[PDB]
């Protein structure tokens, strides 16, 4: 059976080799069935070559030796016994003499078997009668112990066979084998060499470990399946003459670890798009950062922060010694509107997100409140009593501030409690382009806020177009332009920034807030500097 | 001679071994004179063990064989001839029989010498009569060709000698050698083994290459001098049995390359303080850079640049439709003073250095000129005619501008021509702390500039203290404070910045210019905003 025998080549069990009959040996058959002569077999071939060289020197020197082999049996018995001790992994030895000219019986056979701590010699002659390779030349001369010529061999002349399982009493013997053979020549009357016999040994090789990942002198040298594009071959060791025993881990480059991470096939470790996107986990890592854009934007913001703080600090005393409260309140409002890009610079936190909303909505309420309070007061005293309002502006500002303050709180209370308790929503972000990040979530209560600040500003637009230089003329351009900018900004933001880079949205926020707040500041405080 | 022989171990020349007499062999003597059995010698030992095993099996089986050796000489002749063909690097073979009980002559000796394509056998018996190692046991049984016991050897029982140079006709033979020996046992009447002789071969080993950097089975395995702290051992190959043939390059870490860069000694590759300070050259590389400080400072400067440009652009039209020229001129002067840190940001160039001087001196001349022109005009009309000067200020500004303009030019012309032609001075810098950089040089003509701007400002200090709110009161604090700051700044700069980091001096320049120019701008334009 050529099936169970092939299954024996992948598992070391010998009981699986039972239940099979034999009529012929089964020789192994693979890519490297015949590799060459490995080193231990060089050591054994050294033993095998010496016997042949001794025999051919003896037979070439004298022509009677080939005859009278019957009474010279002691020497050949000792020779086969010596050959049988050549290696510890030797199973049998055989010495055979070719017959005389035109005969049917081998003149002599002899075999030695290595059964435990013993050697057995049996004739095997008569009742078993079934049957120049670049030979070197030497000159044989003697001084004290004429001159003639001779022929000799060499250890690499030794021949090797594929591996095979011998079969006995019709059943296959467990344990592979390999035979080494050599030939010894005589001398014929024209004095060129001729064959006279052979000497052989069978060597067991089950304990010899196969290395299949690497190369060099073995038997199955390089026949692994793992491709060296995504995987690296790692041979397991401390085993016998067993095939298929190796793994191949995915190298760090294509470390997708799709095919079990490897413990022209078994190479399907997924090509990782990054160092994270499928390697060390089948999910992505955070998106790349920068340190030139971030610090530059932070410094450019801190410029305006220090400038407005300088204005407020310097404007404290140059009216005390003489509307200071309106001026400092509006400057505090602008300071309060210049935070959010600074707030949207560090790592995210629910406190940070709600604080961003806090500062954003309170700043708008306190700055845009004054703009529209002065606008509709003018339209209410133009042609339709607080002539300058001399404090009543502060009263109306508080009336508008307390309500706005509460809205922020309740939603802050409810959303913060539910988020940090059971988290109907959490800080959670992910790009659809193949990245990951953390972000503050958006809500229907954030849609109410936007609509409330957009209708508040539309009422002022109606106030502007009611009357359609002086105070209101500058304010009209600012209010309409900032409506258009804010509407476009929110319409973009609520559907883009889930899928946008953190740096890109930081830049978007920076450009938006700089444009709108700087435009408002310029177009409100320019008339104050020239009059 | 043990001196020329030791010189032969480091050079392959054989003529240096001449002119020396012998009375005894000279054996090699080193750390690894006796390493073990390398693989090719395992192949030869396989040949040598077989002969001994054949002999001991023959002699144990029959007790008459030990006698009648005289007529059995053919077999032993063939045996020594076979042993002499064991290896191509074999020089001689010898088989000896110990004498009978209480004798003085060896019963038989035989030698075979491998002289070219020939083998010579000579008796060497009679006229050369000068003279259980864990032996295994085997059971000898036969089926067709009783039972008895026996003793056998093994290939690792084979003994090896240190290397040595044989000496003949009193002179030392070139070419090292090594002998392999084995013993064959008989059987004594109580039937335990006893010695009966020996079989030997001498093997030449000159062509065997020594690897001295690595380890493993060789002869002089690991005895190199290069330490693995600064150097890595690199053995040269394609040589014979010659010692001392290796180099050891300095590894990239301690790559000082002081000891010839290596082509507990030869380890003095200088420990490089950096990747450059002694490695790849014995001189340093440029000092480390940064991208967070640099961009931040640049952005913080561009803030003020854009602010002052906005002021100038907005102030163009709000007077045209109605001293605008004085205002824009002073603003241009401040813009001209805010350059130098921007100019001291890129790589250095002689054009860049002279341009820095240009902008620095012209800016001071145009801004500080107006300050002192308004100061001494007040002191000249206070109690000691251009009542407001209504253009005469511009006239006096031109009178002061043309002279200053020329000074910059002449020195620019002369210094630039001489520097770029023969370079009495070049862009050349180097820290004393162990770094390198490029810097603009300082000159006596730069000392004249400093003294000229410091005495110009001292005249204004005298103007301030002459009279000792209004215009001069603000200006007095600014002028004295900026004298103190500028004097300290130059006193530091002319002796520090040759040895200071580029980033540190950029920060110094930034803080200095921000403090002085911002203070001047604030204390001059604050009275303009409130009156």
- Oligomeric state of the chains in view: homodimer
How far from one another are the termini of chain A? 112 Å
Order of helices and strands of chain A: HEHHEEEEEEEEEEEEEHHHHHEEHHH
Q: What's the total helix number of chain A?
A: 11
Protein name (chains A, B): Probable G-protein coupled receptor 179
Subcellular location (chains A, B): Cell membrane; Postsynaptic cell membrane; Cell projection, Dendrite
Family (chains A, B): Belongs to the G-protein coupled receptor 3 family.
Organism (chains A, B): Homo sapiens (Human)
Describe the structure.
2 copies of one chain form a homodimer. With 531 residues, chain A is of the alpha+beta class. Chain A folds into 3 domains: 4-204, no CATH class; 209-285, no CATH class; 292-529, Up-down Bundle (Rhopdopsin 7-helix transmembrane proteins). Helices cover 43% and strands 14% of the residues of chain A. Chain A contains 11 helices and 16 strands. Chain A has helices spanning 4-8, 39-61, 73-84, 292-320, 324-338, 340-343, 350-382, 392-421, 444-467, 471-496, 502-529, and strands at residues 26-27, 90-97, 108-113, 118-122, 136-142, 147-152, 159-160, 164-165, 167-168, 171-172, 177-185, 195-204, 231-235, 246-250, 429-430, 436-437. Chain A has a 6-stranded antiparallel sheet, covered by helices on one side. In chain A, strands 1-8 form a two-stranded antiparallel sheet. In chain A, strands 5-6 form a two-stranded antiparallel sheet. In chain A, strand 3 and strand 4 (118-122) form a beta hairpin. Chain A is rod-shaped, with a radius of gyration of 50 Å. The N and C termini of chain A lie far apart (112 Å). Chains A, B: Glycans are attached at residues 21, 229. Chains A, B: Belongs to the G-protein coupled receptor 3 family. Chains A, B: The chain crosses the membrane at residues 295-315, 324-344, 353-373, 397-417, 447-467, 474-492, 506-526. Chains A, B: It is found in: Cell membrane; Postsynaptic cell membrane; Cell projection, Dendrite. Chains A, B: This is Probable G-protein coupled receptor 179.
């Amino acid at each position: 059976g050529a099936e169970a025998a092939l299954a024996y080549l992948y598992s070391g069990d010998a009981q699986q080799l039972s239940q099979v009959n034999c009529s012929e040996r089964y020789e192994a058959r693979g890519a490297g069935a015949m590799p060459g002569l490995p080193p231990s077999l060089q050591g054994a071939a050294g033993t095998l070559a010496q016997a042949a060289n001794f025999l051919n020197m003896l037979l070439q020197a004298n022509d009677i030796r080939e005859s009278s082999v019957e009474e010279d049996v002691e020497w050949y018995q000792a020779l086969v016994r010596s050959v049988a001790e050549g290696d510890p992994r030797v199973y049998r030895a055989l010495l055979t003499f070719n017959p005389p000219p035109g005969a049917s019986h081998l003149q002599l056979a002899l075999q030695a078997t290595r059964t435990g701590e013993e050697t057995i010699l049996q004739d095997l002659s008569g009742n078993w009668v079934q049957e120049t390779p670049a030979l070197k030349k030497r000159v044989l001369t003697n001084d004290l112990g004429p001159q003639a010529d001779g022929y000799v061999g060499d250890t690499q002349q030794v021949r090797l066979s594929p591996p095979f399982l011998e079969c006995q009493e019709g059943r296959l013997r467990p344990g592979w084998l390999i035979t080494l053979s050599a030939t010894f020549y005589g001398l014929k009357p024209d004095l060129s060499p001729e064959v006279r016999g052979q000497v052989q040994m069978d060597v067991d090789l089950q304990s010899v470990d196969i290395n299949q990942c690497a190369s060099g002198p073995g038997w199955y040298s390089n026949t692994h399946l793992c491709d060296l594009n995504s995987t690296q071959c790692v041979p397991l060791e401390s085993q016998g003459f067993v095939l298929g025993r190796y793994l191949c881990r995915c190298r760090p480059g294509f470390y997708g670890a799709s095919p079990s991470g490897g413990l022209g096939r078994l190479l399907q470790c997924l090509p990782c798009p990054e160092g994270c996107t499928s390697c060390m986990d089948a999910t992505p890592c955070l998106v790349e950062e920068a340190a030139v854009l971030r610090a530059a934007v932070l410094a450019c913001q801190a410029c305006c922060m220090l400038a407005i703080f300088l204005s407020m600090l310097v404007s404290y005393r140059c009216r005390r010694n003489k509307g200071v409260v309106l001026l400092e309140t509006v400057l505090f409002g602008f300071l309060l509107l210049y935070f959010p890009v600074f707030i949207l610079y560090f790592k995210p936190s629910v406190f940070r997100c709600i604080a961003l909303r806090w500062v954003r909505l309170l700043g708008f309420a306190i700055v845009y409140g004054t703009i529209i309070l002065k606008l509709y007061r003018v339209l209410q005293l133009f042609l339709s009593s607080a002539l300058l309002s001399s404090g009543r502006l502060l009263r109306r500002l508080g009336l508008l501030l307390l309500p706005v303050l509460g809205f922020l709180a309740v939603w802050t209370v409810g959303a913060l409690e539910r988020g940090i308790q059971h988290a109907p929503l959490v800080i959670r972000g992910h790009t659809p382009s193949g990245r990951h990040f953390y972000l503050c979530h958006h809500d229907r209560w954030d849609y109410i806020m936007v609509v409330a600040e957009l209708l508040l500003l539309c009422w002022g637009s109606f106030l502007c177009y009611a009357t359609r230089f002086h105070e209101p003329r500058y304010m009209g351009i600012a209010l309409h332009n900032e409506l258009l900018l804010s509407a476009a900004f929110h319409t973009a933001r609520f559907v883009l920034v889930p899928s946008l880079h953190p740096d890109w949205t930081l830049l978007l926020f920076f450009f938006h807030t700089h444009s709108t707040v700087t435009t408002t500041l310029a177009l409100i405080f320019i008339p104050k500097f020239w009059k």
